[PDB]
Amino acid sequence: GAMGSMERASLIQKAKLAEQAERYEDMAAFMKGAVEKGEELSVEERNLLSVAYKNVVGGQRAAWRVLSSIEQKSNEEGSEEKGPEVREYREKVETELQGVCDTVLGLLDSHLIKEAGDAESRVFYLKMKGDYYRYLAEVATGDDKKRIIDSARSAYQEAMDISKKEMPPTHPIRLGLALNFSVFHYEIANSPEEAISLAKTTFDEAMADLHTLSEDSYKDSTLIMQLLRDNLTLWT
């Protein structure tokens, strides 16, 4: 419950309908119900899961940044006191965003990561684990900040180690993992040199392996490769 009474296949079908309707909160609830059925997810199902939560948390993060910016302006010299409401509402959005991250991290810990044995599933879920700890780190300001950052780092690092051993350098999940771990280094871990090195090396190793790919795979790999290029252009 509340998805316990719905067939697994019906939850998957409805997640795809919610995706078409851009109803990402519904999509995430349906996929959470699907995961809670206890069976491993297919590649298509894992992508539905990740898209749903990525969109939900993406909207919450964008809102949090708008509110945090307002809050920061309210704390500058010569700004008029407007009371507690900006902080209260930023905290409200923050707590909801934390709850979504804890929900995703809970699904990963119960029991997606432990049953994931193939590299494509294990790396995918460990990348999600890094991403949702990273989103927690974006809003962390207290005594658990370093531990949250560590947790993101640890998840991404295990995903990187598996992906380098078991996946081609052009694999979209390997490329996406590297893209996000590089963003983690640049924006969360105060390590822009490591972010740039990772994005460079990733892009270059992928370029050298493109020759092995069919026309469809080439298009898939080159798309994430352009995101790496976009960040290199921004950061250098």
Binding site: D131, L179, V183, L227, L234
Partner: peptide, 6 residues
């Protein structure tokens, strides 16, 4: 303007 993630 915003760095990319995926």
């Amino acid at each position: 303007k915003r760095r990319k993630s995926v």
